Structure formats: structure tokens, C-alpha cells
């Protein structure tokens, strides 16, 4: 029982030494530079996440750029994100670029373009023309993060809404909006959306954060804004708003994997229900083995602050005992003062929350849950999570090379590293969001085809003794195709590193 | 399992009615006056804490009289809680009262009190005279809640160490220290903290929270110190620092209770691991069937900020989940901004994940821990839980004059509220820290003995359909003794509501 | 789990002092004396059946006096059982009491009465008119306990089929005719049944054992027969054919209790399926708390040898180990030569398999399969059960009038004897087919109304001590209702004898 | 649970269509000829027991010849086991060679071999040498497989004991002796045994069945006497004793299996107590992965009449629920007068146990009692078991060329066939006493060494097809080693027959 493992723990025992869970950061001006990605990674990120909510296609492609650029110093193979800016609404600039607002104090807000520039008290411009349709009388909009919020009054006209403010509030240049409990029917693609994408298939990127996702048809919308040449691209649907947890099963079954992401979600619902959400998608992402992201103020004191509140720590720790394969840090490593070591704690509260967990409870609850018969490629790889358990294995070792064998033994969650020997670079960098996952890349192209498969598990295995994952004598458990069988691994063996 | 209990929540159903969980405030000049308890009250306050680290005795008693007076309007039996001050180690002061060190400084610290008013940077004195005992070259000295490390160098002579400082400082006079990891020598009270315990002997209150408390004996000897007079008052116990969280069993054993205490206890042990000494802590006091309160910065964004962070959310939501009785707020209502709206959220967040634990997991896994044979106490009241959950009970009434046989229910976690009939009002005040636990006094001297219950059960059973517990036809688990067992209940009924 | 807990069983521990499955007899000239019947109960009987099959009224009248003159002298209660004859089938009489017949022997079987007593090799009468409809060329007809089997060639007229003998037999008169996989249409309750079943209703037996059970409808026919001075006696439907089996579930809602009834049951369908049928059927009567029996050569052998076989053994103890209350003896006690030592070896046999019985898993297994939420009662005894575990109760004590409670109590399956006060000497004999339930008259006419209940717990707990149940100081768990509610129990006690 | 399994079974869906229980049958004058051996093997006989306590080396000669006449027939391996006699205590000689004693006769019995010849209704003879040791005053001695009893009253002298007749008995000459619950030194093998056991090993049987093993030195004795051409031969022990019983661990860790030999044991211990031993010894062996054979009387009454009794039924079904892989016949086959139609009942009902069994509990059972970390080829061996429920394999194929591999798959208990390709006829005729398991021989002295597994492999393949345990696109879970490691298999695949 989770009470009888709890009893157990003890603050005086080694901790894993290797890090199972993984972090995604994204790249601002405190982290940008060859220098300071080089520095991220030491750290330990592992995807780098560009914002184009902001930013224009040339500040990404210096991103872009810097990140390869940096990695390659190091060896590394580090996944890009694009994550999307999407249906966002967001305020116009102000006269002097803030103003302050008391509780009772009557204001228009305007769709007329007009006043982009010029907002003040009285009157200021929102970049939805579609307000007036979406908002009525006595419905609320939500300003800044929903720090302030305004009851509207009346309609003036199409193009206008007078409106009470609920609370005290200073506001800034391009706030966010939030209108939940409103028909908003803007697109998941909209025209800088697409731009966007396409920018982003041919610069290369891993995988789309696809920001607002409400609907399975969304996704595929986004999927066919990649087009012919981003097939392989994975997308990661971010859940931020009612409807996208309402619909999370078809949202889960046609994207890659999902973000949980609690800055829009909790001002689209109650706050208080975020913690619920979370432990509900994550898992269902775990049972059906697809990568799931934790994101947003999870470290958020620590942009200002050398340390972390206690809440903070918690957080990052209970996103991983919820099953999360990643954590996600936005302003912290964007713009923070402590970049190097937001990163270095994150990675220290994995560890700990990894070490604390209930070894064999996943991987149970999972298979538990899994439709028999299974495909055999999903009863070899589950078999070979069990065997590992049972040898204490430290270390597996699979053949992938699309990814989808390493994914499916993460599904298990193993204990040990999974050592991934696959054939491309971009799997390499993609199964950065998966659990427990460490890729090499075999060039076959200069190696060979390696049809026996003895190249590159020979690669694996010097991989885990260089990497001191193990040593002659250990059992590694090596997953991959017998000599005949081509598409999926049919076999296992364990095997002790000569 | 927890997986497939978290793939089934429905996160838009109605939540639970009647909030379990408790909640611990720190009153401050934000929350002091008679009009703001009662605010707070009403926002969900049920303990009132005394911070006897600041402010004077006379600033206290205003606390003490306000809560009192507040309550009493309210018609509210409010817990009050004295947090002592505590034992410290403390540098000694400085020239001009002030020095900056830079990382790679070579300092002397000594325990001779020659040094203790000219402190330089070559050289200051800290107050523990087993200094040079306690940490040995290569150990840690923390200064400044953590801000500043020095590493132990050498022992130049039986009471001087020489020292590396680690990072960039400045030090004013008589700053905290903590040896981590480090046995340490103190008394359980300090001369202060007798005249503070003297003081919340003489003025009635319900809880001693006792800090830094390391080992069961000084536990009994802030028992000793309460005396007879005091010997009503519960101690919970503050663990703070390695030692605490090694001898939990017997503090346990030794206290009426547990606070896990992290602020204190993330500057004496590494962050990430307060949350592997949180879970086993709050386990354990499950177990046993204590209250255990968690606390530090639960909400502190909202000190500021009138919404709490996402990470925020999420450890209010986890110390329900890891099974603690109460949560605690600390500035945020001491000297924050907005403290109605803090103890709001955090009611409904409590309210959240209590609707989101699974109903019956937690009886199970407490049951199952238990030495067979139980008293027959025990066995009634878990028996009692059981039924409650077998006919899905609404309440539960108890009658209790110590309030043993409530915490006793409390202990195996049923989903409905415990009604506690009791005889004592400052067991109404005391039964505050206990989960779901719901108090009404029964005035003995005014209606008499009651020897065969039926007052008393009439007056909880009354109460529960007041207070909208439940209605006429709905079944009730009532738990107290036959008419001649006396000094514990061993009696269940279940009674349909009149 | 079943394999853990046999590999920690000891032949070498003591015994459980408290024998909980109950013995069916059935008596004959072995034992239907005085001095027998003493005998037998002395030696474990508990319940005495008529096989109403053979005999007079005058004989069973016999039975039925000499068992409650037996009872009386040794101040026990037993329960008298009418087993009733039903839709039996039977071949007539022969020529010299004996014919003998070989594989591929031709011989006429007729439903002409004028051959009843002249049966030879070649032509003998079957008792059932409609015998040449039920069974057509090709069928086959299963002679004396399916030992021997016609081939039917042909149907020379309507009175008369032409059949081939498939194997050797020797037949004596009056054998059992089975015609499994035909339309046999004969009445639950016949013109004989009826009178049979009126005289056991004037005669005031306590259970009828209902032959041949085919539907639920069947069951409401044995109801209607036994009239309304006959409500009150309980109804085992005995399931010993297919349709018996497959309407099991309505047949069980519709009865009192189950008699798995081997003998007919393993010739109706394939002999080895008798097994999974067992299971089966007594696992459906354990989870609705029904009383069911297990029947038909337990102890075979011990008919003429003073041991029995090691498979008669094992059957025993497995049908305890399976779940049944009861265990029946036909001709072991009706006609064999030992019958005392037969009843003796099984209840030691019993007593063997109680005490391997894993204490709980019964209680889990039952309770799991309940619909939430419960009657009160129900969770009141389910919970009294738990309780009872909890403290190692040496014994349960409950009310009851009907023996609902009682039955409702041994559902629970608990490992210590209950003991039922009851007002009812009807009650005292009924409970005799329900596990653990030992009985004790309260008569209230003689010694009051008994409404604070005082008096028959008194009764229960002296009955505890003087039987040596339990000792001054042990605790008893105490089942019935507060002084107000009417009509089940609502309260628990755990009570220390006096 | 158990109780949910059995209320769900289908009692008329089609059953297994492949036996996973073995059958023994001992040899006798109704099955020792050519043709009766055949039709033994049609009908379901996997090993044939040759019983030495009776019967010539001649006798035994023609048993051995003609099953391997018959089984070459037939294209079988069948197993030939030597049940030993055994070491044995008996009573001398009397005078007119009986005497009849009657209860309350009072007797003594001596270990001087003076009276060896001249018993009588005074004194007799006992051949132990150690009596008046062994058995103390109120102690029992049991005569003539226990059905006369002698209470112990005093020892006379130290040769001599004073014993006071039980029951009714008339004695012959030289009866057995069994000294219940009582140390026995007697030596391993007998002078006989020794003659017997060289036999044997020159005949080339299969493996021992050692009788009266109550000690793991005695197996180790018996394994000495087998000697260097011996060393493969399998030793069974027999447990007939409380001695065995109580030393059971080390027994079977020193055996290559277990009889629970009831017969004896029965005699030697309580009858009842016999369910408990089985239960235990059965599952103790289960958990070490070592055969475990149920004997004696299972099916007895078929010895005379073609259907078998109800608690006969219900002892096979239930030897198979408790985890023997093989059942038991003696005088049904050995002398009885249905052979071929009793082995065929004890098919059927171990195929209906069988197919009632809850399939992947004994699996889970098991795997939970194994220490971790396990050897490779024991997680290789589980985790292959795995697989096959994963995929509801219809068949696996294990290369074995001990046995080894195939017993430890065997233990997992899959619920289907496990085709075994070796290179030894004796593993072929060994194997057959372990549960699922079916052989085939390739040999590589005709077809070559097959290094890398195919033409095995192949063979096995071609096996599951033409036996009909699969068909064409149907999985398979095959299990050996990979090109390079020696001694044990290290690799599981999943295949689709070609
Ligand atoms: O806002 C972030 O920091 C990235 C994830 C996101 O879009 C959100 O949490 O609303
Ligand atoms: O810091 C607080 O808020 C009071 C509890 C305490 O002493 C601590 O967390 O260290
Ligand atoms: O036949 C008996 O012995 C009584 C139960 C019965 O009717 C049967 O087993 O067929
Ligand atoms: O008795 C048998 O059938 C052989 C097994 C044995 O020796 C026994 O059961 O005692
Ligand atoms: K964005
Ligand atoms: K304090
Ligand atoms: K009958
Ligand atoms: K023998
Ligand atoms: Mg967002
Ligand atoms: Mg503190
Ligand atoms: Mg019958
Ligand atoms: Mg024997």
C-alpha cells in the first residue's frame, strides 16, 4: 500500500544516480547564448521549448542555431519545441505603458484597432473583433493571468463593451485575456500559426506544442498544417482550457503526447480543480504510453530567487510520483536570474521523487490495465520490464528506430535507464520526453545495416560501461528482432556485459 | 489502484459538501483585530496560531482575547495554538555590526565567547559550545537560514574552526545557525520559552506547536515544563532538523501530535528531501492515529498576490493526499494582503482533493497496519468507519468527553463527518486539528449526567439535521458505551434520523 | 494467496476446540432406535433425514418421535429433514429378485404395469407411463446409478421400447431409471409428494429436502403443497439434474437453502463436471448467505469397512474447504455397520479443514461481492464479524427470532462459534444447517418479555462460560438491537464476560 | 477471488482441449501385456510404476520390456518408474501362526530377537532394535497398517513393553509395524532395496520412487546407492511419515521430487491430518519448481466397478486445484477390472479441474514467492510464461536438454502446451511426470548439431502443427539461448507458425 511504502522512506539512503525524468526549459534572453545553453544542459535540460507567442523568426532561428550549435560541443542530442502561440487574446499597449485600476472603476474595452496604441483607464483595445458576439451582459472577463477581472455592463456597440472592474490591478502593455464560459471560435491554426509551423518543418524541429488544443479535429488540423515534409514531427497537445479536458480521451488517441498546462488552465477553470485535471491526464497518458509534460510556475520563485519555496519542491516532486515523464520550466530558465541552478534543483527533486517511488506499482497498474491479447512487440517489451525487476537489472538496452519499442518499454516504467541504440538522429532527439530513455545514434548508412543486430548492441553495451550505467558481469536486458522478423521486436535475452 | 482511480476522476461533478481537512492560521497584524478573526473564521480558520517568536506577551494576549471574543460572536469553539520560540544556535555580533564575505574567504568560527561581540571577517564566535564535537573537517556549517555555507576546513584548537566560505554574503549580528546533519545538545525549552509556556498555561491554550524538537525525551520535558496545571494541553511537536525525522517513532510516541515543520527543516536537510520526511511523517502519524499538521509556504505567493501559483495549488492538494489532518498558513495571514481569499482557496482545495481520494483506500491501508488484537475501543470505532462506509453513512455521532474516541474514528478516515458530542469545551477547541471531526458542547453542570446518552445523542442528532449533515430517514453510525461499560465506547448503532 | 498460506500449514498445531459445519444423517434400521439416535447425535449429528423415498408414514413416524425422545435426553435440539421421493424413476421387479445381462443382450422394456412384478432378461417394467414420448430410437437409458446403459433400437408400440444392453450389470429390483438429455415432464410434487409433504407439515418437521429441483416455479409448487400452516418450514431445493444446474441463480432466490445433490446430479450430466458444479453452486449460496449442503458417498466405504478411503477424506474436507454449512451421510448411517464411527471420523475430518481454513479470506471474498450500500442490519453483522477478528473474539453472541441474524452473521463466515438466543425452538432446529451457529432457547412466555434484551445475553454469556466457548475477561462480540428499534438488529457491543 | 471465480464457471462450455495433468499407473497382472500396455497409453498413461514391494526381477523384466514394446508402437517416451519396497518394522513369527486378541488384552512386546519365532496372545516380537526408546508410556503402536492399537502402559525392561490391546484383532505372522508421531532409524535402503536399485540402473529406468523417506541424508543415501551410472536417474521420495512431513524443505531440496504417499501416511499420521500434509507438500513444491505426484485410492472403487464414486471425482479435481502435476493409480490398474476406463475417468476429471482453474493466479502465486534477484534463465523462464497469457499463446517450445528449462517453465503453470525439442530419449521419458510439458526428440547425432537452434526450433514448430496446438499465423513463445551463450536459455521470442 502507498501507506505501508511511505512508513519506509528514509532521508539517509543513496539516491538513484541516474535520472529518469526529464526537462524541458525555454529559451529567452537570460538563456539563449551558445555559452548559456551549453550551461542548460550541463544543467540538464533536455528539450529546449521556443515560445512563439513572442519573438519573431528570426530570434527562433538563433535559438534554433545556438541550441544545435551548443550540443554538438557536447555531444548531446537535444530535442526543439515549437510551442504555438495559437487563439490567444491579449490587450492592447497603454498610454505610458501602464495604468491602475480601482474596484468600481467603469471602462470600455474596444475591438477597434484604433486604440491599439493608445489605451488608457477609461478605454483600451483587445485583439478579438469578435468580443461583442462572445461576451454579453453580466459575463466576466478575465485580465492578466485572471489577476483582474471584469464584469461587463453593457454593450455599447459592435465594437465596444462597457465594463465594471471587480478588483484593484495594475496592467501593462499586451496582457492576457481569458474568456471562459464564452463561445471564443478562433482557430487552432490561425495564418501566423501556419507560418509558424511551416517555419518550423523547415528548420527541423522535433515535435509542436500546440497551444489550446480543444478537439481530436484540432490536432489533425495542425498535423495537416505540417503537411507532406512534417509527418515525423511529434505533436504534443497542450490542455489549457475546459473543453480540451472534456474531450482529453480523442484529444490523447491523435496526438503524440500531451502537456498539462496549468497557466491558461487554471484561469480557464477553477484553480483549485487543476490539481485533479493533472492527476487524471497524466495517467491517462501513462496507460496508453504516450509522453505527458508538466508545465508552468513549477519552480516559479526561483526567476527572482536563489531558492525555492516549499511548495515549489513539492510540485516538481509530485509531478513525477503523478507519472509525469517530464517537467517543465517557462519564465525560470526565459528570463530568470538563476537559469543553471532552477535547472539543477529540478533535476535534484526528480531524483529524490524517483528514488521515493514504489518500484513495481507502475508498471502493475499499467499492464493491469492493458486489452489482452496484446500485439507481441507490446508482450515482449512488458515481459522485458518484468525480467529486469527480476534480475535487478541495471540497465535495458532496445533497438528502436522509430522510437515506439523505447517508448513502449517507458510505458512499463522500468526502474533502470533504457538505453536506446536507434538509427536516427531525430528519434534520438524526440525520446528527450520520454521517461528513463538515453539514445545512441548507429549511422548505418556509415556502418552498415547491421541485420544480425550485433553492431549495434555491441554500441549499447560499451554505451553502458562507458556512461557507468554497468559493468562486466552485470545482466542487461536487450530488447530487439530475432534475424528474421522485421517491424517491431519479437525477442528478448539478458545478457551479462563481456 | 491509484492509476485507475485517477483515469476515472470526473473533474467537473459536484464536490464534496462538508470539508474533512483542517485549517491552522498565524494571526498577525493582518488578521489581529476582533472584525478580522471573525472574516477569518468564516473563511475557514478552525485553529488560531500564536507566532511566540515575535511580539510580546501583551501582543499575544490581545491575540488570545480577540480570538476568544470573536469565536464567541461566531458561536465558534476555535483551537489556539502557542508556537514557541524555540532553542537557537546564533553567531555572535559583529564590528560595525556588519561583514561581507566573497566565496573562497578563509574564516575562523569559535565557540570561545571572548570573540562574541567583535566578530570580524578573519574571525566570530558562535554560541554552541559542542561545536567543534559536531562537525568535523569536510562538514557543513549553515549561516543566515542556509544562505551562507562554510565548509569545516580544520579544528585549529578544542573550540575554533577554520573555515572556507562557499558563496557571497553579508552577515549583520547574531544571524541563525544550523549544523545539518549534525547532532545537537540543546534543552527542549529555553528560559524563554518557560516563561512563554508559563504564560499559555496561565491564559488557557489548547496546543503547545514546540520547535526544534529532536528526541522523545525533550518532549517530556516540555510536558514537565506545562506541569499539572498544563497537563490537558496538547504538544505537538515541530520536526525540524535530521534528528527529528530519525527519531520519529518515539517523538510520535511521546507527543499528542506532529507539525512538519519545512521551512526549518529544508534549511537542516537538503529541499528535495522534505518531501520524502513529509510523506513517511504524515504516514506515521496516520498509522498511530495523531494529527499532524503540514506547513511553510503553502500559499505564500498570495502574501502578494490574491491568486496562488500553479505549484501552489498543487502542495495544498498533496498534504491532503499524503494524509494530513490540517494545513497551515504562515504570513499569508500573519501580514499578507489577502487573508480571507488565502484560507478560501485553501478550503476549496482541500475540498478537491479530499473529493478526489479514493474512498476507502486509506481505511484499508490503515486497518491493515494494525496489531491484532485490537483494544476493543479500537476494533468498535474502525468497525464503526466500516459500517459508515457500508451504508454509506452521511455522519457519524461519538460521544467523547477527552475527545480520544473521536480522534480514534477520525483515525480510520471515513468520507462523512464525525459529530463529537463532548462534555469539555476545550475538547471542542482541541478535536480542531483532527480530520472531519465536527464539535458541539454538551453542558453537563446545565442538563444534567446523562448516564443512558440520550441527551447527548439527541443533541448531535439534532445538530446533524441543523447543520444539514443529514435528514429525517438517513442512517447514522453512532458510536458510545452501553449503559454500565465505563472510560471508553464500546457500543455501534446505526439509527435512522427522525 | 491460497499457495503462501499452504506452504505455512503444520500437522503438528492444535485443533480448533469448536466444531463449525454441521452433519446431516439420514437414518434407517442402522439407526432409527433411541439408543442409536442418542448415538448418532452424541457423535455429531445435527440434522436427521427422512428419505422419504422408502417407507411408510408409520416408519417415518417412527423416526421422527425416537429422534425428539433422543434430543430430548440429551437436551439438544435437532432438526428434522423430509427428503422428498419426487420425480423418481424405477425399473419393476424380477423373476427370483435378480436377472443378470451382457453386452449386446436385446431385452423390452415396458410401461405396462401387468409386468411390474415379473421382470426377466428379456422383458421388465419402468414406473414411468410416459417412457416411449421421453426417449426415442437411439436415446439411452442409465440403469441403477447409471451403471448399466440401454441403447434404445426401437419403439415397438407404446408401452414397449426394444433395447440393446451396452455393457454387463446385474440387476436387483426396484433400481433407479435416469434418462438425461429427455423430455421427462413429471410433477416437483406428485400426488405422494403432496400427502408426504402435508404429513411432514402436521407433523411439524423443520426442513424439507425437495428432489429434483427444475426451476424456481418448481420451488413455489413445494411452497403451495406445504400450505399455510407449512410457511415457516424451510425449503432445500436439491440440484441433481442439468436444468437444475443452469436455472441455478432463480432456483437459489426462490429457495431457503441448496442440497448439492452428487448421486442424481453425476449421473444427469458427466460425472467429473459434478466437481465444478460443487464449486460453483456453493460459492452462489455463500455470497447470499444461504445455507448449503453437500451430499451423496462422503464417506462412502465406511458403509462396511471401519476406515474410510483416503479420496472420502479429502472430499470432506474439501466441501469444507469449499464452503458448505453441512455435510450429509446416506447409507454410511442409514444401513452401514459403523455408523457411529462414521459420523465421529467426519467431524473430525471437519474440524481439520476449519483449521486450515485461512480465517479471512471467506469474510473479503463475501464482503466484496455485496451491493453498497447495505441494509443496516447486514452492516451491522458484516461489521460485528470484523470486530470479532479484530479482537480474536472466542465467540459471537446474537438475538434472533426467525434466525435471520444468525444466518446473516455466519455469512460473514467468521472463525469463532455464534451463539444465537433464540425464542423459537423451530429457530434452534433450523440453524442447525448454518455454519458456526450454536443455539440456546429463551422462552419468553415462561420468563418475560425480555425488551432490554438483558435477560437473554445473560442466557448467551452463561451459556458461553458453562459450555467453555470463552472465560471471565475474554471478550464476546454482542449482536441485537437498542431498546427501540423492532424488527433486526442495529447494534454491536464488544462486552468482557463477567 | 476464489469465491468470484467459482460463482462465474461455466460448467457446459467446452472444456481444455489438451491435458496439462500427468497420470501414473502401476503395472500388474491386468496391464502388463503388450496390448494392455497400449491401450494404458491410449487411454492416458505418461510413466508406468513398477511396484517392488511385490513381484520377481523376472515380473518386473517383462513390465519394463513390454512398455517400451508398446510404447515404440505407439511412437511414445514413457516414463518407467521403481517404487522401492522400502526398509520395514514388523511383528515375528507367532505360534500356529496367528493369534486373536480382544480390547482390554494386555501384551507385551519385545525387541529380544529370543521370542522372534514364538509369539503369542502374551508376548511377541518387534524387529527394531530401538523400541523401548522410541515410544514412551501412553505412546501407541500401531499393528498391521494401523488397525490394531496398542497403548503403551510401562516399560518392563529395556527390551520389553507392557501394551494394552485397543480393538478386536486377529494377528498372523510378521505384520507391519508403524510407530506414530515417533523418531524412526532405520537406514535408507535395504539389503533388498540395494538389489533392487541395481536392477534398475542396469534396466535403465527412469527414476526411483523411494518409499518411507523421512530424512534429506536418506535421499542422499539413496542417490549414493544409484551411484555414478545412477546419477541421472530421477529420485522421487515418498512421504509416508510425520518425520518426512516435519523435514519436508530439506527433503525436497535434496529430491528430484515428491510423492505424497496417503496410504502410508494415513497409517502413520492422523487420516484427516493427510489433507493437510497434501495441501502443504503439494505447494511447497510448486514454489521450488519440483514435481509433485498425488497417490493412493484415488479412483479405488473403479477397481470393481466402472464408474468411479463422488468422492473420488472430487479427490482428483482437488489433487490437481492444489498443484500436482501428476495423479495416481495403484490397484485400479494394477489388478483392477477397468484399467483402460478408470486411467480414461481420471483424464477427464483432471481436464475439467483444469479448465475450472483461475488461470494466472498460481503464475502471480509463484512469481511473488521467488527471491529476487532471480538467475537469468529463471527470469527468462517466468517472463516467457508472461508473454504466453499476454498474447493467449496457444503453445510454447522450449529446448531442454536436462529437463531443466522445461521443469522451471513448467513451474510458471501456463495454461498451455509447452512443447519440449531435446536431445535425450531419457528427458523425453523424464519429462513426463512434469505438468503442460510434451516432448520430442531430435537427434543430433542423425541430423547434425544445430548450434544456432533452427532445425530444432523447426522440428518443434512442425510438432504444434501437426499435433494441432496450433495452426498457421497463431503465436507461439519460444524460449533457448542465443548463438552464443552456453548452459542455460537467456532469450524468449515471440513467433507466428509459418
Ligand atoms: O505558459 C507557459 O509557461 C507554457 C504552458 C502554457 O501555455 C500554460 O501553462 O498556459
Ligand atoms: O515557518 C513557519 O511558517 C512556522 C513553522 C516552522 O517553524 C518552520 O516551517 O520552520
Ligand atoms: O441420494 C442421496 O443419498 C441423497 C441426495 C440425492 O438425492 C442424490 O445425491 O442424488
Ligand atoms: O499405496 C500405494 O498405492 C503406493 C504409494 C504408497 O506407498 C502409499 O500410499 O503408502
Ligand atoms: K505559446
Ligand atoms: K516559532
Ligand atoms: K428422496
Ligand atoms: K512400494
Ligand atoms: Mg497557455
Ligand atoms: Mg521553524
Ligand atoms: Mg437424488
Ligand atoms: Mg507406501
Chains 1, 2, 3, 4 share one sequence.
Not at 526537462?23 to 551558445?34: K, L, R, Y
Not at 508498471?363 to 515481459?383: G, R, T
Not at 515506439?404 to 524526440?430: F, G, H
Request: aromatic share 4%; net charge neutral.
Amino acid at each position: 500500500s502507498q501507506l505501508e511504502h511511505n512508513i519506509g522512506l528514509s532521508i539517509f539512503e543513496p539516491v538513484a544516480k541516474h535520472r529518469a525524468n526529464r526537462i524541458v526549459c525555454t529559451i529567452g534572453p537570460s538563456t539563449q547564448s551558445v555559452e548559456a545553453l551549453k550551461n542548460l544542459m550541463k544543467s540538464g535540460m533536455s528539450v529546449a521549448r521556443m515560445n512563439f507567442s513572442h519573438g519573431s523568426h528570426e530570434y527562433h532561428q538563433t535559438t534554433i542555431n545556438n541550441v544545435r550549435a551548443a550540443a554538438a560541443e557536447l555531444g548531446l542530442h537535444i530535442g526543439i519545441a515549437l510551442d504555438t502561440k495559437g487563439p490567444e487574446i491579449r490587450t492592447g499597449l497603454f498610454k505610458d505603458g501602464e495604468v491602475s485600476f480601482a474596484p468600481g472603476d467603469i471602462v470600455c474595452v474596444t475591438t477597434d484597432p484604433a486604440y491599439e496604441k493608445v489605451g488608457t483607464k477609461e478605454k483600451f483595445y483587445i485583439d478579438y473583433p469578435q468580443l461583442t458576439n462572445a461576451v454579453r451582459p453580466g459575463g466576466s472577463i478575465y485580465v492578466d493571468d485572471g489577476v483582474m477581472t471584469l464584469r461587463v455592463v453593457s454593450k455599447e456597440d459592435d465594437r465596444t463593451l462597457k465594463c465594471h472592474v471587480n478588483n484593484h490591478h495594475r496592467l501593462t502593455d499586451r496582457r492576457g485575456i481569458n474568456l471562459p464560459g464564452c463561445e471564443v471560435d478562433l482557430p487552432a491554426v490561425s495564418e501566423k500559426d501556419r507560418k509558424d509551423l511551416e517555419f518550423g518543418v523547415a528548420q527541423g524541429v522535433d515535435m509542436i506544442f500546440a497551444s489550446f488544443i480543444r478537439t481530436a479535429e484540432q490536432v489533425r488540423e495542425v498535423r495537416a498544417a505540417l503537411g507532406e515534409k512534417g509527418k515525423d514531427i511529434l505533436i504534443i497537445s497542450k490542455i489549457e482550457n475546459h473543453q480540451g479536458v472534456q474531450n482529453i480521451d480523442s484529444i490523447i488517441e491523435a496526438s503524440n503526447g500531451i502537456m498539462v498546462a496549468r497557466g491558461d488552465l487554471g484561469v480557464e477553470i477553477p484553480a483549485e480543480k487543476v490539481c485533479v485535471a493533472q492527476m487524471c491526464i497524466i495517467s491517462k497518458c501513462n496507460v496508453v504510453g504516450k509522453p505527458v509534460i508538466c508545465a508552468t510556475q513549477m519552480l516559479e520563485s526561483m526567476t527572482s530567487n536563489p531558492r525555492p519555496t516549499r511548495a515549489e519542491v513539492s510540485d516538481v516532486a509530485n509531478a513525477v510520483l503523478n507519472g509525469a515523464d517530464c517537467v517543465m520550466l517557462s519564465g525560470e530558465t526565459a528570463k530568470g536570474k538563476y537559469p543553471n541552478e532552477v535547472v539543477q534543483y529540478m533535476a535534484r527533486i526528480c531524483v529524490e521523487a524517483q528514488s521515493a517511488t514504489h518500484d513495481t506499482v507502475m508498471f502493475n497498474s499499467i499492464k493491469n490495465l492493458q486489452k489482452i491479447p496484446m500485439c507481441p512487440e507490446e508482450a515482449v517489451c512488458s515481459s522485458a520490464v518484468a525480467s529486469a525487476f527480476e534480475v535487478q537489472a541495471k540497465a535495458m538496452l532496445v533497438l528502436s528506430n522509430t522510437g515506439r519499442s523505447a517508448r513502449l518499454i517507458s510505458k512499463y516504467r522500468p526502474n533502470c535507464p533504457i538505453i536506446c541504440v536507434t538509427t536516427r538522429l531525430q528519434t534520438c532527439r524526440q525520446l528527450n520526453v520520454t521517461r528513463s530513455v538515453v539514445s545512441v545514434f548507429y549511422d548505418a548508412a556509415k556502418s552498415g545495416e547491421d541485420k544480425d543486430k550485433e553492431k549495434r548492441v555491441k554500441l549499447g553495451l560499451d554505451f553502458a560501461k562507458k556512461e557507468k550505467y554497468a559493468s562486466t558481469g552485470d545482466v542487461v536486458v536487450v530488447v530487439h528482432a530475432d534475424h528474421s522478423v522485421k517491424g517491431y521486436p519479437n525477442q528478448t535475452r539478458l545478457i551479462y556485459l563481456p
